[PDB]
């Protein structure tokens, strides 16, 4: 269902990383498989060639935490007006305090040791259930 369209109509795009994370751009190919592309360091930009109807999403390259692009989950390049590229502004979401705490706890505790933490079982489960693109694609469908 969620897949790029094979339009062959070029669309030039600027990926702008306005987050403090290393960004992994992910292209959804014609069968809907996620294809990872080169990462963007924090604060950096890249002018890239894409196509109309193509679907992109953006993740923290290290943790796969979710990021937003133009304030939403998916970015689809559109028709260029007057030869101008489309801007893909990549930003942190306002994570819930809970998800933000899970991020920090995950970065400090090796996964073998989640169970050793003195917290209710359901928080072990929340930590183990770390962000992943597959899961989100199932969600977004």
């Amino acid at each position: 269902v969620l897949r790029s369209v094979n339009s062959r109509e070029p669309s030039q795009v600027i990926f702008c990383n306005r987050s403090p994370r290393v960004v992994l751009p992910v292209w959804l190919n014609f069968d809907g498989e996620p294809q990872p592309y080169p990462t963007l360091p924090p604060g950096t930009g890249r002018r890239i060639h894409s196509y109309r109807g193509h679907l992109w999403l953006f993740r923290d390259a290290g943790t796969h935490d979710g990021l937003l692009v133009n304030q939403t989950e998916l970015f689809v390049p559109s028709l260029n007006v007057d030869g101008q590229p489309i801007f893909a502004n990549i930003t942190l979401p306002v994570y819930t305090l809970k998800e933000r705490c899970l991020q920090v706890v995950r970065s400090l505790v090796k996964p073998e040791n989640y169970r050793r933490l003195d917290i209710v079982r359901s928080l072990y489960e929340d930590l183990e259930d770390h962000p992943n693109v597959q899961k989100d694609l199932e969600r977004l469908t």
């Binding site: 706890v105 400090l108 505790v109 090796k110 040791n113 050793r116 933490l117 003195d118």
Partner: protein, 104 residues
């Protein structure tokens, strides 16, 4: 520009925001609305420095880029009891425990 503050006295902490251009006296009116004490019974501080009523929060160094929503700047507060003002007393927050082994 908004500045984000914690106004602190003893074991009391008010979270609020104000304009950089607003005055110390105007902050006292804010505290008055919350703690029911008028400006003449209030002293505001930045650290140990007593703040002048007529000055802006900006002039007293509370700026949009230092007094942030996720890291607000602290304004000290003292009340007059009868004739004289109590000393500035701010109770520290509790201490975090030691990091568990598995977080080192």
């Amino acid at each position: 520009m908004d500045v984000f503050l914690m106004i602190r006295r003893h074991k009391t902490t008010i979270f609020t925001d104000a304009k950089e251009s607003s005055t110390v006296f105007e902050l006292k009116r804010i505290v008055e609305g919350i703690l029911k004490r008028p400006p003449d019974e209030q002293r505001l501080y930045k650290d140990d420095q007593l703040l002048d009523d007529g000055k802006t929060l900006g002039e007293c160094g509370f700026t949009s880029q230092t007094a942030r929503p996720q890291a607000p700047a602290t304004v000290g507060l003292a009340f007059r009891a009868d004739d004289t003002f109590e000393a500035l007393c701010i109770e520290p927050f509790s201490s975090p425990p030691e990091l568990p082994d598995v977080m080192k």
